[PDB]
Amino acid sequence: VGSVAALLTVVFYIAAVMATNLYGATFPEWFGDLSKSLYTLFQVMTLESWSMGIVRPVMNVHPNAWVFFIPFIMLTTFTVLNLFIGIIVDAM
Amino acid sequence: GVGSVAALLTVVFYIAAVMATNLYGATFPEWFGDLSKSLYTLFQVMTLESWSMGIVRPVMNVHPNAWVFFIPFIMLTTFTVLNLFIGIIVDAMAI
Amino acid sequence: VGSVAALLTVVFYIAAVMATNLYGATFPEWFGDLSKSLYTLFQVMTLESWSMGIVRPVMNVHPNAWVFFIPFIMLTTFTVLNLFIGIIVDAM
Amino acid sequence: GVGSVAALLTVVFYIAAVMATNLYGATFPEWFGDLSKSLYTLFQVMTLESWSMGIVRPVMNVHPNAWVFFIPFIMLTTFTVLNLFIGIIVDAMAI
Ligand SMILES: CCCCCCCCCC(=O)N(CCO)C[C@@H](O)[C@@H](O)[C@@H](O)[C@@H](O)CO
Numbered sequence: 491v492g493s494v495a496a497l498l499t500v501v502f503y504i505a506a507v508m509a510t511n512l513y514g515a516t517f518p519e520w521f522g523d524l525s526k527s528l529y530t531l532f533q534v535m536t537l538e539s540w541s542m543g544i545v546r547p548v549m550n551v552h553p554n555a556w557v558f559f560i561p562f563i564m565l566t567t568f569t570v571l572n573l574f575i576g577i578i579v580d581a582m
Numbered sequence: 583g584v585g586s587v588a589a590l591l592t593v594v595f596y597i598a599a600v601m602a603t604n605l606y607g608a609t610f611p612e613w614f615g616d617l618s619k620s621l622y623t624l625f626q627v628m629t630l631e632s633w634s635m636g637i638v639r640p641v642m643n644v645h646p647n648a649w650v651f652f653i654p655f656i657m658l659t660t661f662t663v664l665n666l667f668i669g670i671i672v673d674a675m676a677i
Numbered sequence: 678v679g680s681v682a683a684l685l686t687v688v689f690y691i692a693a694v695m696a697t698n699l700y701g702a703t704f705p706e707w708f709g710d711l712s713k714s715l716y717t718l719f720q721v722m723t724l725e726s727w728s729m730g731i732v733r734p735v736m737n738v739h740p741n742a743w744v745f746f747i748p749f750i751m752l753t754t755f756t757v758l759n760l761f762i763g764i765i766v767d768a769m
Numbered sequence: 770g771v772g773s774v775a776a777l778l779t780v781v782f783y784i785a786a787v788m789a790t791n792l793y794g795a796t797f798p799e800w801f802g803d804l805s806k807s808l809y810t811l812f813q814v815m816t817l818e819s820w821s822m823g824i825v826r827p828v829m830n831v832h833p834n835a836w837v838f839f840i841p842f843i844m845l846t847t848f849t850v851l852n853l854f855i856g857i858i859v860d861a862m863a864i
Pocket residue numbers: 502525526528529530532642646647649653
């Protein structure tokens with residue numbers, strides 16, 4: 491549980507560092523600085539406008555942007571679910 | 583204890599809707615103008631429908647730290663709702 | 678499980694009958710006929726644009742529309758989750 | 770059997786993306802123009818992001834029965850994904 495939350499924080503910072511670098515100059519409102527990146531990736535993780543709102547606009551400049559976001563969604567959504575289940579299981 | 587979980591959620595929902603009415607009511611009246619409008623918006627935000635693009639990003643354009651309220655709200659309420667729904671299903675199977 | 682799926686089908690038809698009647702004349706693209714209603718309520722159940730896309734526009738004509746949709750979401754989302762868990766538990 | 774579940778999902782994803790490319794490719798080329806565009810749209814539809822307002826409702830304006838493909842697709846894939854993720858967590862706890 492504590493290790494799961496630690497893994498998620500590491501992945502969140504590494505991904506937000508990568509995203510700032512990859513799409514920061516082209517998409518500054520969403521990935522302009524580490525803070526803007528951490529906010530966008532949290533939004534993308536919850537799945538709110540991930541494609542129509544973020545990825546489809548991003549792919550119009552970077553056609554492979556899906557190689558970053560789709561694996562990010564698969565990894566973080568599974569981890570978040572696994573973490574929440576882990577909290578409930580340990581408390582019981 | 584299921585009933586206590588639902589009670590905790592109702593308290594958190596009213597406290598948050600009181601806080602939100604005060605924080606964003608004057609600037610964003612269609613969404614947080616009164617306690618009722620606030621309770622509706624926070625239910626929407628809790629389900630995750632247009633939470634960012636639709637609500638938080640427009641709210642952050644006036645209040646840049648609005649994320650300090652909404653992100654912890656989402657983390658707390660979504661976990662509690664999940665925990666509550668699991669608790670109902672687990673207790674009904676045992677009984 | 679079979680009874681859960683049966684309860685959901687009854688609730689889906691009753692709600693789509695109610696919705697056709699309540700918002701059919703005012704919102705015909707979404708609730709014009711039982712079919713359009715069953716499609717909208719399935720969308721609302723999955724939570725896609727339930728508020729900004731459907732309920733907020735509907736509330737502008739019917740200010741209490743939330744008394745129908747919010748309890749509908751609470752009932753159907755819980756039942757769907759309970760049904761899917763029930764399938765997985767019975768198969769194991 | 771986890772590995773078989775992931776295998777079933779991949780088969781369903783390719784079959785559905787083949788079917789969708791054929792059905793809506795000429796009418797909706799930005800979303801279903803090629804197998805790649807189709808696999809991306811169906812992943813989006815599977816996560817439920819703008820599935821109706823963004824994709825299906827525009828698609829139904831040309832193909833009124835499009836719901837016969839997408840609604841069963843959502844029911845099948847979302848259940849399988851949930852079942853797969855639960856299967857991973859259950860097997861890791863047992864081992
Ligand atoms: C799961 C973990 C998710 C963490 C999410 C962190 C979000 C941080 C967002 C943020 O702070 N900003 C980007 C907004 O998108 C910047 C501004 O809103 C504002 O904070 C600044 O101007 C200054 O106040 C900094 O001191």
